[PDB]
């Protein structure tokens, strides 16, 4: 489909060999479409553009779905992967998207228009992206809850 990539970070890692050092570039890339599908990927190569290529190819296997009632997440949720945490809150209409570095990319490539968020834990980009993905995975719509609990949509609320 129509995918928009966005490099989040590029890092230059190194390993020590008997003759000195060896350097490799690792790229983190978040891809997705503005309709509600988004994923992330990590690639590593001895050259940056090939690192982005590997990252986008890896990312193309980890789509998720973001329930986005009225261009807004249904409710607040905390993602707690690894050592990092992200807190997401629904926001008023036309308020924009306010977020840190990579969580902004994740929430903007998914098509969510209005949301608030705060990085309550660490600031490593990989862990922030993973925590945001977990928090999104903890999201459920009113229709689904009504179906689960028997009560219809209106009697639910």
Looking at the Cβ atoms of 6 and 24, the one nearer to other proteins is 6
Please give the full DSSP string across the chain, using - where no structure is assigned: ------EEEEEEEEEEETTEEEEEEEEEEEEEETTTEEEEEEEEESSHHHHHHHHHHHHTT--EE---TTSS-SS-EEE--TT--EEEEE--TT--EE--HHHHHHHHHTT--SEEEEE-S---HHHHHHHHHHHHHT---HHHHHHHTSS-HHHH-
Minimum distance between the CB of residue 16 and other proteins, rounded to whole angstroms? 26
Looking at the Cβ atoms of 60 and 97, the one nearer to other proteins is 97
Looking at the Cβ atoms of 57 and 70, the one nearer to other proteins is 70
Minimum distance between the CB of residue 25 and other proteins, rounded to whole angstroms? 17
Looking at the Cβ atoms of 42 and 98, the one nearer to other proteins is 98
Minimum distance between the CB of residue 15 and other proteins, rounded to whole angstroms? 29
Q: What residues line the site for other proteins (CB under 8 A)? A: 74-76, 90, 93-98, 104, 113, 140, 142, 145, 148-151, 156-157
């Amino acid at each position: 489909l129509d995918l928009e990539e966005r490099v989040v970070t590029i890092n230059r890692v190194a390993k020590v060999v008997k003759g000195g050092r060896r350097f490799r570039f690792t790229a983190l890339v978040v891809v997705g479409d503005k309709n509600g599908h988004v994923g992330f990927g990590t690639g590593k190569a001895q050259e940056v553009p090939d690192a982005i290529r590997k990252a986008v190819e890896d990312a193309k296997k980890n789509m998720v779905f973001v329930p986005t009632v009225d261009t807004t997440i249904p409710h607040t949720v905390v993602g707690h992967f690894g050592g990092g945490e992200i807190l997401l809150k629904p926001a008023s209409a036309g308020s924009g998207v306010t977020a840190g570095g990579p969580v902004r990319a994740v929430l903007e490539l998914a098509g969510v228009a209005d949301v608030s968020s705060k990085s309550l834990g660490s600031n490593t980009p990989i862990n922030m992206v993973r925590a945001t993905i977990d928090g999104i995975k903890q999201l459920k719509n009113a229709e689904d809850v009504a179906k689960l609990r028997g009560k219809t949509v209106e009697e639910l609320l």
